[PDB]
């Protein structure tokens, strides 16, 4: 559980926002990319796994699950690649709600930045800091407990 | 101490590698940029502060310390901007040694990736995972102890 992440791809302003969610805490990292390709997803995962102890990733779709480049990155970084099928259906709704929430925050900051990528990083900040603990606090506590 | 980071700019292959070091743990995040501008440094800091609880940043040089865009990002993210003057001179040698170490790792992986940015993220991964605890383990424990 401390090492489980879920990928999530959402769209805004004709661009793609790729999100990784730490399932147990709700903590996220995100980036704007021109389109979801295997190469972009693979690079995003390499970044994520260098920053947090990523053991398992539930991939967001079958193309990324199949991608040889995504598979290469998961091999390189020691990540177990799994499907993202919500066997528990409350999983879908949780991600859906998060995408709506993230888009809301993006709208609230959009005018403070010229570029979407900046607004997305502002949204990541607000999401991870929002309080009762924050997602940032929860992920650190979960991983620290696991290390001990 | 749990919230203190230091910026570090190093060069390779005609490109710029911007690094943030969590001083107490040795944990890093890094990116490749075409050149070190206020705008790039500001964006990097916004990303960092959304991901870790960044209280204080020792900026890497006077141009970034002065930059209105860097100041705007620090204001936005609640970061206290400080100079990076090594009043304690062992600070300079520590960063120097880390840049040499990072470049060594980059050379060891360079052939496994087409692009420098990829090699840098591989280097971040290896640096943060290297063991006795790793830098990734130390930063999590430090912040968790602080939260409690
Ligand atoms: C920290 C926030 C409050 C401001 C900065 C600077 N932006 C402005 O002042 C433009 C402006 C906004 C309203 N009127 C004029 C945002 C920023 C920082 C770094 C970047 C950016 C951006 C961006 O604008 O997307 O793009 C890539 O690197
Ligand atoms: C996970 C590692 C082991 C491989 C991947 C895929 N690269 C190759 O297979 C090319 C190759 C290298 C040697 N011979 C053929 C690296 C990678 C992933 C994602 C990216 C990249 C790169 C990159 O190559 O820089 O660039 C931006 O998005
Ligand atoms: Cl790690
Ligand atoms: Cl945080």
UniProtKB/TrEMBL annotation, chains A, B:
Residues 1-143 form the Integrase catalytic domain. It is found in: Host cell membrane; Host cytoplasm; Host nucleus; Virion. It catalyses: 3'-end directed exonucleolytic cleavage of viral RNA-DNA hybrid; Endohydrolysis of RNA in RNA/DNA hybrids. Three different cleavage modes: 1. sequence-specific internal cleavage of RNA. Human immunodeficiency virus type 1 and Moloney murine leukemia virus enzymes prefer to cleave the RNA strand one nucleotide away from the RNA-DNA junction. 2. RNA 5'-end directed cleavage 13-19 nucleotides from the RNA end. 3. DNA 3'-end directed cleavage 15-20 nucleotides away from the primer terminus. One of its GO terms (molecular function) is zinc ion binding. Keywords: Aspartyl protease, Capsid protein, DNA integration, DNA recombination, DNA-binding, DNA-directed DNA polymerase, Endonuclease, Eukaryotic host gene expression shutoff by virus, Eukaryotic host translation shutoff by virus, Host cell membrane, Host cytoplasm, Host gene expression shutoff by virus, Host membrane, Host nucleus, Host-virus interaction, Hydrolase, Lipid-binding, Lipoprotein, Magnesium, Membrane, Metal-binding, Multifunctional enzyme, Myristate, Nuclease, Nucleotidyltransferase, Phosphoprotein, Protease, Repeat, RNA-binding, RNA-directed DNA polymerase, Transferase, Viral genome integration, Viral nucleoprotein, Viral penetration into host nucleus, Viral release from host cell, Virion, Virion maturation, Virus entry into host cell, Zinc, Zinc-finger. Its cofactor is Mg(2+). GO terms for biological process: DNA integration; DNA recombination; establishment of integrated proviral latency; proteolysis; symbiont entry into host cell; symbiont-mediated suppression of host gene expression; viral genome integration into host DNA; viral penetration into host nucleus. GO terms for cellular component: host cell; host cell cytoplasm; host cell nucleus; host cell plasma membrane; viral nucleocapsid. It is a lipid-anchor. The keyword Cytoplasm does not apply. This is Gag-Pol polyprotein.
């Amino acid at each position: 559980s401390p090492g489980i992440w879920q990928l999530d791809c959402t769209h805004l302003e004709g661009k793609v926002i790729l999100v990784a969610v730490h399932v147990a805490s709700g903590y996220i990292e995100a980036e704007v990319i021109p389109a979801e390709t295997g190469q972009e997803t693979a690079y995003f995962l390499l970044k994520l796994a260098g920053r947090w102890p990523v053991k398992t990733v539930h991939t967001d779709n079958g193309s990324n699950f199949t991608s040889t480049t995504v598979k290469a990155a998961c091999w390189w970084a020691g990540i177990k690649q799994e499907d993202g099928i919500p066997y528990n259906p409350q999983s879908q709704g949780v991600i859906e709600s998060m995408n709506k929430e993230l888009k809301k925050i993006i709208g609230q900051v959009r005018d403070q930045a010229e570029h979407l990528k900046t607004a997305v990083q502002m949204a990541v900040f607000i999401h991870n800091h929002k309080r009762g603990y924050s997602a940032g606090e929860r992920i650190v506590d979960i991983i620290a407990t696991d290390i001990q």
